[model samples]
Target: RILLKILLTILIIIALFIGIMYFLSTRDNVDELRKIENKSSFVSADNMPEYVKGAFISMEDERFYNHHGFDLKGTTRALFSTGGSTITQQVVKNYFYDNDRSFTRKVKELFVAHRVEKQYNKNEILSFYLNNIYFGDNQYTLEGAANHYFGTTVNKNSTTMSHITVLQSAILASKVNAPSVYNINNMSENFTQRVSTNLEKMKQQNYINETQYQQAMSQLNR
Candidate 1:
């Protein structure tokens, strides 16, 4: 009886996931996702500033590359609260559905996340994520962020670190999770700590050289 109940429960969850995923994958949702994925075709991951990518990967999903659709370690942590969903899962949540935390939502997230991972490469996924997320000041893409945070626009056409500063990239990356907290103008008191944490993660991941890291650290409050 115990085993039967467990099996039935699992079956029901699977059914719910499939049903929800299908329902959520509407034409409108798919179209929007496609647009996001295709936004930075010229400014692919190879062009993205290293610190920006590192900050997100370290802070959001340390095991992003290792996971298929679901994050085993992050999921284990999510049993207590948020942080289980991988970056692909966040794309599904942001683009397709409400930020609902119900069983139905997570199951559907996994299904749709698998689709995102399967349909897009790492560069495409990173580009979509960077291009579609909110940065402070109603900014929708990285360039909008650059203008607000750095008083300049980064070149979206080429792979060049000269377009922006390391601290600026870390600052931009810091806002995706809490735009208000890391606002470009008069950030919340904890702004430096949050951005600094991400910068440290970038360095720890070897995404930035020690000299670059030091330069960023020294200039945060400047």
Candidate 2:
């Protein structure tokens, strides 16, 4: 029994060491914030419109500020639901963890998400998440997303005329997973429904006033 215990302890120590190193090495792999090649314009948080922020919150994480780095509800739902993932978790997975579907990969992703929450603030985390998220068609960041979809460059010094209207919301929402697939009709029912859902969520969350909401609704119909 004594010999068996000693051998078990040694094995445990080795396993723990390997786990720690793997965690450390893969933590920074989620580089969803790099500027891609040939992207002339990019938009940073400084110049991003309030509506864009609202739309993101409405569509991605309604409880972005309230939660820690991970949204247990969203994560759980994603595990069973058709498809749903928190922006932070997505960032962790996109940058650090591999796309391999495995229990181990998911466990490590959770750890990385928790670590990122501890290390960054909501805005900083959102910024990185936005900058790093994939928008399909060779676009890797928000700047790339904006440029690729709207044909606008990311303006550092000034805000663009690009308003986050219902149409834009549809575009953004559809592109969240794969822009190319959803960009075809540009005004499909899927796009419209997502935009409507996002808008309602934003209003309920108090991100936009009744007047703004009404105006957005009107424009969307047009």
Candidate 3:
């Protein structure tokens, strides 16, 4: 009797899984996602510099390249308290849904992130996140912030315009968490410290070498 009950429970769970996946996939706001992409300022992720990508990965989601969509540790914590949102989940929240932080919202976010990972590669998702997220002072895209704060564009083969420096990239990465608090224009001590921490993590992750780390730190110290 117990064995039969266990088997039935497993079957029900499996059915629910399929039902939820189908529902979330169908409800995805693909048109809205494309609408943002169609904008002229929408920079593709491939064009972004490695350090810029690194800064974000190191600071935001260390397991970005490893996980399918969501990290177990972070997503588990996200259920009750907070923290543990992967980059993929962040992309889903930023584009697909509203600012509601309910349990239902998170469960949907997890499934949608799984769906997104299946549809897009890591870099493509990173592009989706970086291009769509808001920076302080009306900056909406990384390309926009790059041009405004660093006076450089995100071109891998640009010989004329310089690429954004490591420190500049780190600063931009730090700004996303608290744009006004970490305002690049008037960086507070709190903001400066976060950028410094970002650079350190970047170095630890081999995204930036020791020399690059030192250079970024000196710039931050100034």
Best by TM-score: 3
**lDDT of each residue in 85-199, candidate 3, tens digit only:** 8888888888877466766676677777877788888888888888888787688888888888878877676777888899988988888875565678888999998899999
lDDT against the true structure, per candidate, is 0.71, 0.64, 0.82
Q: Which digits, one per residue and each the tens of the lDDT, describe model 1 over residues 1-222?
A: 899999999999988868866676543244356666455322445565566677678777777777776888778887896566788787777776744676656665676777777777766776667676777677777766776667654553444434777787777777778646456677665888888898898898888889998999999866
Q: Residue 125's C-alpha lDDT in candidate 1?
A: 74
**TM-scores for every candidate against the unseen true structure:** 0.80, 0.71, 0.84
What residue runs in model 3 are displaced by over 4 Å at the alpha carbon? Answer: 1-25, 77-82
Best by lDDT: 3
Can you write out model 2's per-residue Cα lDDT over 132-215, one digit (the tens) per residue?
Answer: 666666676676666667765444344554444544543464467643445523566665666677778777877677887777
Predictions: Cα RMSD each: 3.6, 4.9, 3.2
Q: State in Å the error of residue 16, model 3.
A: 5.9
Model 2 spans with C-alpha error above 4 angstroms: 1-42, 79-84, 151-170, 178-180
lDDT of 3 at 191: 90
